[PDB]
Design a protein around this ligand. Structure first.
Ligand code: ZN
Lengths: 48, 187, 171, 39
């Protein structure tokens, strides 16, 4: 995200990039969000 | 629409923005209000490219847009985006970009002061000038660090500070020509 | 081809003939001879004469006969510069580099000779779009200036805060 | 919806930054009314 702002990337790219950052931040706090994908550990086992 | 506003908009857009933004402004200069679709055909730009440029022009509020919804001859709904230049909002935003840069001089100067004057190169750990005295051993007669048992040199931390000062006076040169441009806002 | 295949060969043969350097016009019957289309239908003979050989932008009607249109195509450095100038003056838009190359043989010589007079925009597919270099008002500055300008984020600010700064600093 | 907020009056997506400024402008006294100790 920092490079995109530094390089003045497309607004939609940042908007999509921000969405992924929001997912991981929310996912780390809680991996059982309502009606949202479960972030596995690359093996089908949901992260705690 | 006084010619002073029209003349400046070209001057500013050609300065801080690429030819793509200037070309779009020319269409709005010729006609007070122009459809988004009409601009796309005239400029022949890509749909995503034009939208990104328009979004950037909307980011600084140089030109405003209004959405008109009507029924086409075949019955399908038509939503046309009409873009028009708002000089009153443009002047305020462009003026805001002056004081920030003008006041940016103070902010940049603080960056140099942040760097520590004394540093230890061997251990690659910044040494506080006061902490050096406590770390300094009176028996040895020269300041040293116990963990690495080597002499310290603060000359290295000196050179980066000098360069940053040139970047400041060099920064001011950029906004000097624009100061002349923005005088057309007040006229 | 019936009603569609014959015309394609006429266009191809005509295009090749011009590349040889024969600017002289050619009649409908004359062109048919070298294209092995002597048995073309009568209704196609009038259709080509009335529609195909006039509506096409590469067919010039001269003294009744038909000839290529190298004038519209760019074949000189001066024409290349003039075409871009008209596009900017009338706001028609840019032209892809590939379109100029086919129209202008050895377009590199003309492009390099004009130099900065042509503005090149690289499309995602490597295609280059040419735009006239309007030298009326120019302003180029150091790279770091834009970097600092980019560092000043403005899309994430509200109008009230943006306008409040003016009175905050007293301007 | 999901992790994104929508504001309608027409409709524009609300980003986390767009909400930060409003919260900063809130006075300490207003927090007491909202049942949240400012300190
Ligand atoms: Zn050390």
């Amino acid at each position: 995200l920092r490079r995109n702002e530094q390089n003045g990337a497309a607004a939609h790219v940042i908007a999509e990039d921000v969405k992924l950052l929001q997912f991981h931040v929310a996912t780390m706090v809680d991996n059982e969000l309502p009606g949202l994908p479960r972030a596995m550990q690359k093996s089908g086992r949901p992260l705690k | 629409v006084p010619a002073a506003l029209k003349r400046l908009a070209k001057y500013v857009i050609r300065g801080f923005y690429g030819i793509e933004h200037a070309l779009a402004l020319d269409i709005l200069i010729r006609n007070s209000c122009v459809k988004e679709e009409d601009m796309l055909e005239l400029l022949k730009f890509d749909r995503k490219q034009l939208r990104s440029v328009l979004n950037n022009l909307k980011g600084d509020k140089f030109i405003k847009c209004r959405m008109r919804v009507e029924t086409a001859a075949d019955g399908k709904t038509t939503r046309h985006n009409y873009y028009f230049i708002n000089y009153r909002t443009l002047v305020n935003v462009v003026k805001y970009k002056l004081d920030h840069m003008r006041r940016r001089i103070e902010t940049d100067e603080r960056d140099s002061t942040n760097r520590a004057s004394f540093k230890c190169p061997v251990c690659s750990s910044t040494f506080t000038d006061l902490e050096a005295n406590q770390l300094f051993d009176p028996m040895t007669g020269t300041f040293r660090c116990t963990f690495c048992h080597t002499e310290v040199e603060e000359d290295e931390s000196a050179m980066p500070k000098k360069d940053a000062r040139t970047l400041l006076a060099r920064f001011n040169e950029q906004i000097e020509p624009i100061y002349a441009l923005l005088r057309e806002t007040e006229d | 081809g019936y009603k569609f295949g014959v015309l394609a060969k006429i266009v191809n043969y005509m295009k090749t003939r011009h590349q040889r350097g024969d600017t002289h016009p050619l009649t409908l019957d004359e062109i048919l001879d070298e294209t092995q289309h002597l048995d073309i239908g009568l209704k196609q003979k009038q259709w080509l004469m009335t529609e195909a050989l006039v509506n096409n932008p590469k067919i010039e009607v001269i003294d009744g006969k038909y000839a290529f249109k190298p004038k519209y195509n760019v074949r000189d450095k001066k024409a290349l510069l003039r075409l871009l100038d008209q596009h900017d003056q009338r706001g028609l838009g840019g032209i892809l580099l590939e379109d100029i190359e086919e129209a202008l043989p050895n377009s590199q010589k003309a492009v390099k000779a004009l130099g900065d007079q042509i503005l090149f925009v690289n499309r995602p597919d490597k295609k280059k779009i040419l735009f006239f270099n309007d030298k009326s008002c120019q302003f180029s500055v150091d790279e770091e200036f834009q970097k600092l300008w980019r560092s000043v984020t403005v899309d994430s600010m509200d109008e009230e805060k943006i306008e409040e700064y003016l009175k905050r600093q007293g301007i | 919806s999901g992790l994104e907020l929508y504001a309608e009056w027409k409709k524009i997506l609300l980003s986390p930054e767009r909400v930060h400024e409003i919260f900063k402008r809130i006075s300490d006294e207003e927090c007491f009314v909202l049942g949240m100790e400012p300190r």
